[PDB]
With several copies, the nearest count.
Chain A
Amino acid sequence: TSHDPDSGGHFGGPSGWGGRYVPEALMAVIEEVTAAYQKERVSQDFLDDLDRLQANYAGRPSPLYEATRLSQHAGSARIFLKREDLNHTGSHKINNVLGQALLARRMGKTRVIAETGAGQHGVATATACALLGLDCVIYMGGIDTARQALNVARMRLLGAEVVAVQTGSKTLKDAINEAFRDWVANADNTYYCFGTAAGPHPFPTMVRDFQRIIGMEARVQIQGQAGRLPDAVVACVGGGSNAIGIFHAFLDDPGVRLVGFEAAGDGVETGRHAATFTAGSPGAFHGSFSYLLQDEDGQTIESHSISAGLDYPGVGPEHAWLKEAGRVDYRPITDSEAMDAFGLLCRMEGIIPAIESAHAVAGALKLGVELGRGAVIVVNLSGRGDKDVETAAKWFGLL
């Protein structure tokens, strides 16, 4: 398509977003996955299995719901919620996993590994591996196993082995490091089911392609319900999978604003945040050239966020390309702002969101005040908040 990278995975030509910043030891399996995806993405047998699982198993299409009780809290704008929280396993991650798990089987791989931070990608990977009869190992930071314990037990119930990563900041970037070390050693029989729109080529493109169904549905649904294209489409941005998935169908609609909201932790001025675009700079990290939080020597600055899914110091390269082109704007949302939107969504619409998604809801409220009455703002509600109930109840003193 018009927005795809070259055969080397580079977005935007000379700027060099993406690519493959991996060791040569991984190139045989990386090229192996790239070829298998190019072969199967045009195979009707493959596409039939994917659509069929998304329909009868994952529960697609997810609905688009106008949260009318939020309007007065958003400058009387019209907030539409793309209800990815209603998917099987409870987030958008199942979209990307069903595609990659089917691909892992087409390649003959007998083992699937994955990282997880909020646990949603781990639960999704474990879910598809149980369905397809694949061995599954999930790497999860020790801090993430504590604050997302519900998903740890869900993964173990689904037959997946969970390895707690205790190195580094014990969060998402540390689980990715360990899963990389695993893939290097077991590349000939193990498929790496990467969970976000980052990594080396072909993963930023392939993950986005499996998440494009979100925006394609949203673009049809918003025209049917509102009579026109939205004034803005917003989503939270950790690595960038749920945002790029809903953004993509609107890239060529020049009137549609696109805003991604990243985690700002205790505040961007505090050094305890994950605001990659707000405070980071270009660099090579986790297989791609993109933005990341780094110090003056290029060492990765550890991120912090109340949300485990956005607690990541990097970002996918296609987002760095869209920021450079000025097509998408990226704004910070703090822990406090996200938790306010959390409770507000509970009391107004009876929807308990993932703390990740609460960032997008918080930014939508601020964008609604800017755009004014009658403005249509589509929000990607990436997941539900079952995993975050303990954290949120403690935040509001309900114990």
Chain B
Amino acid sequence: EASRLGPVFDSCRANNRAALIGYLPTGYPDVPASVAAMTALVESGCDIIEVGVPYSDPGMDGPTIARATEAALRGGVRVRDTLAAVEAISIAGGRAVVMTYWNPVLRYGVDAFARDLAAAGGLGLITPDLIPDEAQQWLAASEEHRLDRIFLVAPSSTPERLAATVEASRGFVYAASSQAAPELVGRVKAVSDIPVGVGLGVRSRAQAAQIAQYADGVIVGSALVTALTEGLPRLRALTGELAAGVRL
């Protein structure tokens, strides 16, 4: 009937604010510490958790996240550790989605991964290297197992492709990247009501406030990894600051 993350953006729209979306890669600095940090995000006010699957060749990830996933893979992180991390988040009352590259899903099996992700309490899948043109197996798996499919749009996206990408998305649309971020959100809102998340290398409470003025959700990742690297208390404080910037 509706999307899985729909009720979360409705609760933020009634409370007149944007949703705080937090990213953390499984297995950094290790699997137990990453799960403890992801639980800390839920406690510190994160509306949605992006559980990252470390990939050996992450083309889209920046230096802070790439080096974190490299360390996690050196530590021996496995794909099943992500599903175990989603279950711990859903048990702790959180709302988690999985952001992965597509080959680990193909290796796992698209249907098998969707089924086991849903069974763990996962709500959706963010696919940075899977465009709708190749998402036949994923579209079917997203329907049967009732999972949101969060595709990515870009400033360089043509109008035809932006419409096709938005029409194919359930839950929210990841607007990834001057004045480009609000301009990209405006082009999405001109063709659909679906919520729009914005990732912009958010560091401070003020930056999350600027984005919450036009975006339905604010995506933070690199800063959270940097915070967790210093210490677990530093992550709580930063997540708390970011939890206040989205309410302005």
Footprint of B on A, CB under 8 Å?
8, 15, 19-25, 27-29, 31, 167-168, 173, 177, 180-181, 184, 187-188, 282-285, 289, 294, 296-300
Contact = CB atoms under 8 A, between A and B. Distances in A.
A28 B131 contact: no
Nearest to A297: B79
Contacts of A27: 131, 154, 156-158, 161
B35 interface: no
B104 to A, nearest CB: 4
Contact of A24 (B104, B105, B107, B131): B131
Contacts, number: 96
A170 to B, nearest CB: 13
Question: 8 smallest A-B Cβ distances: which pairs?
Answer: A298-B107, A25-B154, A298-B104, A299-B56, A28-B156, A300-B56, A298-B103, A284-B103
B134 A181 contact: no
B23 interface: no
A25 B79 contact: no
12 contacts: A22-B131, A24-B131, A24-B165, A25-B157, A25-B176, A31-B158, A168-B57, A283-B103, A284-B102, A289-B106, A298-B79, A300-B57
Interface in B111-158: 128-131, 133-134, 136-137, 151-154, 156-158
Contact of A298 (B106, B153, B157): B106
Given A27-B157, A285-B57, 10 more contacts: A20-B131, A23-B131, A23-B154, A24-B153, A27-B156, A28-B157, A284-B102, A284-B103, A298-B79, A298-B106
Given A25-B156, A284-B103, A299 B55 contact: yes
Contacts of A15: 134, 136-137
B203 interface: no
Contacts of B66: 167
Contacts of B152: 23-25
B131 A297 contact: no
Interface residues of B, number: 34
Contacts of A25: 60, 152, 154, 156-157, 176
A228 B156 CA distance: 53
B78 interface: yes
A27 B152 CA distance: 11
A29 B156 CA distance: 9
Contacts of A289: 106
Q: By DSSP majority rule, is chain A's interface helix, strand, loop, or mixed?
A: mixed
Given A31-B158, A298-B108, A184 B59 contact: yes
Contacts of B57: 168, 173, 177, 285, 300
Given A297-B104, A298-B107, A28 B161 contact: yes
B103 A294 contact: yes
A285 B59 CA distance: 11
B131 A294 contact: no
A181 B59 contact: yes
Contacts of B105: 298
A20 B134 contact: yes
B192 to A, nearest CB: 16
B73 interface: yes
Contact of A283 (B106, B151, B153): B106
A259 B16 CA distance: 65
Interface string B172-190: 0000100000000000000
B27 to A, nearest CB: 12
Contacts of B151: 24
Contacts of B79: 297-298
A20 B130 CA distance: 8
Contacts of A184: 59-60
Contacts of A19: 133-134
Contacts of A8: 133
Interface in B45-83: 55-57, 59-60, 66, 73, 78-79
Contacts of B59: 23, 177, 180-181, 184
Contacts of A168: 56-57
A231 to B, nearest CB: 38
A244 B46 CA distance: 51
Nearest to B155: A25
Nearest to A174: B57
A298 B129 CA distance: 14
B103 to A, nearest CB: 4
A19 B104 CA distance: 17
A188 B154 CA distance: 13
A296 to B, nearest CB: 7
A24 B103 contact: no
- Count chain B CB atoms within 10 A of each CB in A8, A22, A282 and give the residue with the most: A22
A24 B137 contact: no
Contacts of A31: 158, 161
A154 B67 CA distance: 33
Contacts of B107: 283, 294, 296-298
A282 B136 CA distance: 17
Nearest to A173: B57
Nearest to B132: A24
- Count chain B CB atoms within 10 A of each CB in A19, A25, A173 and give the residue with the most: A25
B78 A28 contact: no
Contacts of B137: 15
Contacts of B128: 23
Nearest to B78: A297
Contacts of B73: 299
A288 to B, nearest CB: 11
